[PDB]
Amino acid sequence: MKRKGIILAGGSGTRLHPATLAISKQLLPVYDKPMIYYPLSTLMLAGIREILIISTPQDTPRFQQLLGDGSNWGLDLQYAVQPSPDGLAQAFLIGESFIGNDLSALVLGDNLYYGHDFHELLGSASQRQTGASVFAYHVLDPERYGVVEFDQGGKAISLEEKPLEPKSNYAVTGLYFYDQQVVDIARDLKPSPRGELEITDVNRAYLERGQLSVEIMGRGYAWLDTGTHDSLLEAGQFIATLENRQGLKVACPEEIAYRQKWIDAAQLEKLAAPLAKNGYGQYLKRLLTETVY
Amino acid sequence: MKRKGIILAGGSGTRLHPATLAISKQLLPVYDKPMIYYPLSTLMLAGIREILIISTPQDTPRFQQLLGDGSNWGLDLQYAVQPSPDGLAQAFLIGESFIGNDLSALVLGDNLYYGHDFHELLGSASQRQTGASVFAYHVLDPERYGVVEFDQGGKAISLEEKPLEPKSNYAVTGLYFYDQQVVDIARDPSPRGELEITDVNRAYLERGQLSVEIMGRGYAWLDTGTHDSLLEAGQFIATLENRQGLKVACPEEIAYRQKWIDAAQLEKLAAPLAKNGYGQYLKRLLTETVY
Amino acid sequence: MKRKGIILAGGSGTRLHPATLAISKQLLPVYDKPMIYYPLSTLMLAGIREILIISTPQDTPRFQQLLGDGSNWGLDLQYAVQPSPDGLAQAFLIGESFIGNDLSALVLGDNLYYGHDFHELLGSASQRQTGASVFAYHVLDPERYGVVEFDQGGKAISLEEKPLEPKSNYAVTGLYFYDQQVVDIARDPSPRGELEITDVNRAYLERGQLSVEIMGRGYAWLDTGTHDSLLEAGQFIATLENRQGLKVACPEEIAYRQKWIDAAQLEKLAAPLAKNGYGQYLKRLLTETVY
Amino acid sequence: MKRKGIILAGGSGTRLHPATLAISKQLLPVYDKPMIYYPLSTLMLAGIREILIISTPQDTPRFQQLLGDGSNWGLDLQYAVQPSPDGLAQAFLIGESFIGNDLSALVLGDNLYYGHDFHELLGSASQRQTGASVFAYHVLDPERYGVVEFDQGGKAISLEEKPLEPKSNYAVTGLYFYDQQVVDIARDLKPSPRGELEITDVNRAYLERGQLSVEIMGRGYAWLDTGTHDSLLEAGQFIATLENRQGLKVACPEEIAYRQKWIDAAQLEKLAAPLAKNGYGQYLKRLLTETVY
Numbered sequence A, D: 001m002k003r004k005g006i007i008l009a010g011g012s013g014t015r016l017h018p019a020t021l022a023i024s025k026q027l028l029p030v031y032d033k034p035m036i037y038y039p040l041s042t043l044m045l046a047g048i049r050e051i052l053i054i055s056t057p058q059d060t061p062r063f064q065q066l067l068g069d070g071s072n073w074g075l076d077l078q079y080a081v082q083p084s085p086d087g088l089a090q091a092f093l094i095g096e097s098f099i100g101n102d103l104s105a106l107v108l109g110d111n112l113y114y115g116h117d118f119h120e121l122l123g124s125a126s127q128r129q130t131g132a133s134v135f136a137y138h139v140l141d142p143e144r145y146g147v148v149e150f151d152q153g154g155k156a157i158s159l160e161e162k163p164l165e166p167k168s169n170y171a172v173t174g175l176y177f178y179d180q181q182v183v184d185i186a187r188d189l190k191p192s193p194r195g196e197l198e199i200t201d202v203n204r205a206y207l208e209r210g211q212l213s214v215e216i217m218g219r220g221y222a223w224l225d226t227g228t229h230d231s232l233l234e235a236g237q238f239i240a241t242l243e244n245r246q247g248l249k250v251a252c253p254e255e256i257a258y259r260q261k262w263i264d265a266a267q268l269e270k271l272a273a274p275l276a277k278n279g280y281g282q283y284l285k286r287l288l289t290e291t292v293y
Numbered sequence B, C: 001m002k003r004k005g006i007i008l009a010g011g012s013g014t015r016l017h018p019a020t021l022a023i024s025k026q027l028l029p030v031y032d033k034p035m036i037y038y039p040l041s042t043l044m045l046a047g048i049r050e051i052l053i054i055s056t057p058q059d060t061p062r063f064q065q066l067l068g069d070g071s072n073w074g075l076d077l078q079y080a081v082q083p084s085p086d087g088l089a090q091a092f093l094i095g096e097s098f099i100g101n102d103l104s105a106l107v108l109g110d111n112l113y114y115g116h117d118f119h120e121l122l123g124s125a126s127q128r129q130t131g132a133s134v135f136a137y138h139v140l141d142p143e144r145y146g147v148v149e150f151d152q153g154g155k156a157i158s159l160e161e162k163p164l165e166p167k168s169n170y171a172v173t174g175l176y177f178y179d180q181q182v183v184d185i186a187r188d189p190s191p192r193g194e195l196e197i198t199d200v201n202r203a204y205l206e207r208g209q210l211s212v213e214i215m216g217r218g219y220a221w222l223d224t225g226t227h228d229s230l231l232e233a234g235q236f237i238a239t240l241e242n243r244q245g246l247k248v249a250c251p252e253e254i255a256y257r258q259k260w261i262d263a264a265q266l267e268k269l270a271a272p273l274a275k276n277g278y279g280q281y282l283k284r285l286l287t288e289t290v291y
């Protein structure tokens, strides 16, 4: 069965103004590439090629102008708008006809993931054709997230959205896998007390049916979010340190598509040409004539 | 006499791609505000209110959308396009009718300055109504800049553009003050195929009309031209702002302190942004004395 | 009249353990040099050559091993021990016979200052031979410091130590100048069980002898008291040094520029370090003019 | 068969002066703990409890004063001096009687490792009772390291120490596993043209006998070194970003010994007591009453 992807690139409102008066949030760079390359790479590493980008009416054309239809990277990218920021779970109503009767995956536009065998840790989630899969990650400030409570045998028994009194330090990360029920679950939701269709309510719905798999994303993975000026900066420094140490890029879509066999050596060479003058083009050119294990 | 300002916010080419496939370099943020706010604040701190922004045809509307005509901040901002990146000295040909018969000042769009009594160090340059003024600053890699050589008595005797063998570690920073002769000097290419600002400055030096002031080690002059240096500049500005609770290069603040806009106008500007830290900061400025 | 200096480099307790189980906080490096070089350079920039370092019994030998008696840098460094951390004002009782009948200056061991004409901003404080002088600096978290309140005409009217409800955002920085009365003021505990420097400063304020000078936003005053702030201060100093090719708080440099040691002495100091960047930097200073 | 560990904490000379006039290099902190906690944690994660720390005559007592005999953390730590920095391979001559007839592992004192299932990636190396095991890692500046060349089928065929013209971008990291031959291999070495007993010559000796296993440490691992002022700073920022995001520490020996079952809850509580006032003590206390997966 096919799995489709959605990237939710919502409007951060005026919270990052005036930086985001110039460019949309998920167009801001993290070190050396646009923020949106990171969640796109995550979907690509899960084996997902068919992807809907959802953003504001102002920002959608800008994502389109940047990314096109994805064919240069062996992807099929489509676009849709969220007129009003009425909660993340709206992505499934907006995305209803894109999803059709297929399996899906949702990723937040400002989330970055780094670590080992990331290709394989997503594989187990992506292959599960029934129910929902999410990842829990130990954090210092769980109040800011969806928080998962486990019983004494490590079984997930409760999910709470931004609790004032968190039950654990396990946050739910911004990457979600769903089966064919998610659209119908979303339509039956009622708005929260904040006036939003919450993704945690979608996840609670699967939990109450005993169909939520909660996998642990271990301490040896980096899950970062780029939602404040401070966290964007930190994420920049983190990616720069890795790239400058390794001479290998994090979340380079051209590279990921080449290694996945979605584009070939000739196509990668064409992509490198316009950028040959700068470090990013030189990097893509180097990939053709080097074995990276 | 009036002094007009020019900000050269040109096409970064492909050097910062793909980050700048989203936008021109001078729209990228340095920590919490667009790059272009920093050179704009420098011009404002020199007392300059009438400013021409020069950028690519593609980027001009984006600067316009960000900054408008400047009237909200007591400024008069105008725009011009540079079809092709043919050297920094082209700013005076493109900007010829904007400048008219007035004094001018040119600043590069990716330069940031921080330090003490900055308002006052620019004052002496801005109020000199004859000849040209530039600033020299000790750097580690002078080969990347215009380099000034001094004689034993501290007099400038030579300028060189990006020398492979620099004569000193004094770079000429990206801020230049000119009198009414600069357009005519400019109208009169290098081996690289560009109209060099260093040739304009050499022209003033050879007629004995170049003031070279030292910008001391207690000032920060940073360049935001690479991915690495943009990140560094971000960390630097964050550290200062988070330490002080005072912003670097907030134009609304600078206009308010210059008396270009008043308390009521500042309050209006703060309203739309009230929900975020930047709006809250502008609101706090109304009810606090900063010395 | 002579002014003597004191650096309080006391026991950080257990707050930075286990990092400081290796050494006292003021021996940790800020980027490329020990923390203590920064407050020592501040005292030197004020013209102070005779300096008492106060630290724990365990740490004193380590400071001594690092710094010696100071003669290599044209200084006279003396050491005293603080058995117990009983407040910053204890420095004047411990330091009583070192001070004698002279003027004094106290600096905290984990404070760093950067900015323009810093030599000259300290000069006005250092040369005031009567009363006390402190500096006020706008900060984001004034609750962590001594806080000064000003009246409508910018006169200091109140000082409070770590107030839960600060009257302003002006903190008193960790650098203090005193006349001959401070020892007697000091000899005359808070609810926390400590001899507070803010009580010493209040005493001078109540006799109308406290000069409170503003350290403006164009200066950097950083505190290296947490793991996070020490890291930030490191990044800040690295950015400046790597931009300029000039060091912050290099005592050998400061002594050379103050004329306390000469070219031959500086060359001797550079020899043992010739293999690393710090030695190479001292060697470069001999054959370059820095304005 | 037992495996013993050596941490080489050598004298960086005057290269980091004057910072290292106050404290020895491997006593400098990386963010919130002494540099040496990081390579010690690496050895502990390989299951090694018996460890020799080698450093200069000036620095050895300082390591002793910091770490003791290791019994508080369920370790057995011993100390030895290297009078003169005559190459890293000297560690096996100095360490000869400590090693005895056992298997060994050498780790450099200024190397930091971060990533997933790190416990398990070392397990395969630690269990190999014959020959030597090293790790290769893609880097940007391979000239600074021991560089491994691979043939077309991914077999290691050459090792070069700091080559002017590197054959690949695969550096050998500062962690080495050896069998009972390493002492004898080291004694038969001749000094290099630089006047040092090189670890690369020890590794070449195993390669020429076909007994060098070279495993790839993938791009999803962070291998950092803390040998310059700049790299020490970068490593600090990197560790701070991870710790402040996760509320979990990197390379906390007390934690690693507790999770390995080398010390128990009561012993961990005793260790936390003296430090209760600060964040590190509070962290150890929190570990007693939380499940970390």
Ligand SMILES: O=C1CC(=O)N(CCc2ccccc2)C(=O)N1
Pocket (backbone or CB within 6 Å): A041, A118, A119, A249, A250, A251, A252, A255, A256, A259, A260
């Ligand atoms: O940020 C990344 C993470 C990553 O794992 N990779 C390697 C991905 C890969 C490897 C082999 C087969 C298929 C895919 C990457 O190019 N960039």
Ligand SMILES: O=C1CC(=O)N(CCc2ccccc2)C(=O)N1
Pocket (backbone or CB within 6 Å): B041, B118, B119, B247, B248, B249, B250, B253, B254, B257, B258
């Ligand atoms: O980035 C800055 C640097 C600065 O100096 N200032 C102070 C400006 C000022 C102008 C006129 C009278 C008094 C103060 C600022 O608001 N932002």
Ligand SMILES: O=C1CC(=O)N(CCc2ccccc2)C(=O)N1
Pocket (backbone or CB within 6 Å): C041, C118, C119, C247, C248, C249, C250, C253, C254, C257, C258
């Ligand atoms: O950290 C610093 C800050 C500073 O201003 N200086 C310049 C000191 C000086 C002293 C006397 C005459 C001229 C210059 C320095 O060498 N290191």
Ligand SMILES: O=C1CC(=O)N(CCc2ccccc2)C(=O)N1
Pocket (backbone or CB within 6 Å): D041, D118, D119, D249, D250, D251, D252, D255, D256, D259, D260
């Ligand atoms: O820097 C680290 C890396 C690490 O993996 N861990 C967990 C280690 C562990 C887990 C389970 C059983 C045995 C050991 C750690 O405490 N600190």
Ligand SMILES: [Cl-]
Pocket (backbone or CB within 6 Å): A217, A218, A219, A220, A221, D115, D116, D117
């Ligand atoms: Cl893990």
Ligand SMILES: [Cl-]
Pocket (backbone or CB within 6 Å): B215, B216, B217, B218, B219, C115, C116, C117, C118
């Ligand atoms: Cl200066």
Ligand SMILES: [Cl-]
Pocket (backbone or CB within 6 Å): B115, B116, B117, B118, C215, C216, C217, C218, C219
């Ligand atoms: Cl100032």
Ligand SMILES: [Cl-]
Pocket (backbone or CB within 6 Å): A115, A116, A117, D217, D218, D219, D220, D221
């Ligand atoms: Cl990997």
